[PDB]
């Protein structure tokens, strides 16, 4: 995250860190005791999740480690299009209980509104060109922009992809390398998933692209109910 500051230690209880033995590589959102939502492109053959984390060096007392018991991506997703249905559901190998630094964030109940103020967060790079990874997660506020802005900046962004466009018109505040999979929270609602962006990060003509969570809520709920055979909207 660039153009921001260190997050408050209590404002990201739902933030999940994805890591392997090399380090953190993605973020995720705890939506209930046994489920985490992240980006499909954050999938890997071997990884674990750390909950209740703030600083990588100073352990939080209630920090928990979890493994992916089951993973779900849209059955009708085209694997050759990284921007097509970039969302993945993960069932934990063991449920977690609410604690000082751990609590779920509910699925959105209302669609995103252009012009709303949104917050981004993650352990991604805090510098635009060079890669500088912080020990603590950084936070920043940005605006939900008209989809036309991203359309003009990204020739690869097709109209059929269910995405949201966010940042500020002049650039300078944006997600960066390593923030993928994290939540985009607008008006207190989990509205998007960090999905795609450009490098250098924070270019005015190239705002961040986030997966529209609202559109996948029904699919998500059916998988949680036990209908892991459900398909995503075209
Ligand atoms: C730990 O994971 C990192 C990153 O994994 C990749 O990126 C994730 C977002 C997700 O898409 C995964 O499926 C990817 O594999 C690995 O680091 C990458 O390693 C490759 C080659 O080894 C390198 O080209 C990339 O630049 C690295 N990171 C980036 C920028 O993506 C790392 O190898 C994994 N550690 C182990 C031991 O498995």
Curated annotation (Swiss-Prot):
Regulation of this protein's activity per its record: Inhibited by NPGB, leupeptin, aprotinin and PMSF, but not by EDTA, SBTI, heparin and hirudin.
Q: InterPro entries, alphabetically?
A: Peptidase_S1_PA, Peptidase_S1_PA_chymotrypsin, Peptidase_S1A, Trypsin_dom, TRYPSIN_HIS, TRYPSIN_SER
Peptidase S1 domain location = 1-225
Alphabetical keyword list: Disulfide bond, Fibrinogenolytic toxin, Glycoprotein, Hemostasis impairing toxin, Hydrolase, Protease, Secreted, Serine protease, Signal, Toxin, Zymogen
Q: What is its main location?
A: secreted
Question: What's the protein here called?
Answer: Snake venom serine protease Dav-PA
| SUPFAM superfamilies referenced in this protein's UniProt entry, alphabetically | Trypsin-like serine proteases
The glycosylation sites annotated in the UniProt record are 20
Database matches in PROSITE patterns: TRYPSIN_DOM (PS50240), TRYPSIN_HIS (PS00134), TRYPSIN_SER (PS00135)
Q: Please give the family membership noted in the entry.
A: Belongs to the peptidase S1 family. Snake venom subfamily.
Compartments (UniProt record): Secreted
Q: List the disulfide bonds.
A: 7-139, 26-42, 74-232, 118-186, 150-165, 176-201
**Protein role:** Snake venom serine protease that has fibrinogenolytic activities. Also possess esterolysis and amidolytic activities. Selectively cleaves Arg-|-Xaa bonds.
Family annotation (Pfam families): Trypsin
Q: Which GO terms describe its biological process?
A: proteolysis
Kindly list the GO CC terms recorded for this protein: extracellular region; secretory granule
Q: What is its EC number?
A: 3.4.21.-
Its Gene Ontology molecular function terms? serine-type endopeptidase activity; toxin activity
Q: Where is the active site?
A: 41, 86, 180
According to its UniProt record, in which tissues is this protein expressed?
Answer: Expressed by the venom gland.
**Superkingdom per UniProt:** Eukaryota
Q: Quaternary structure per UniProt?
A: Monomer.
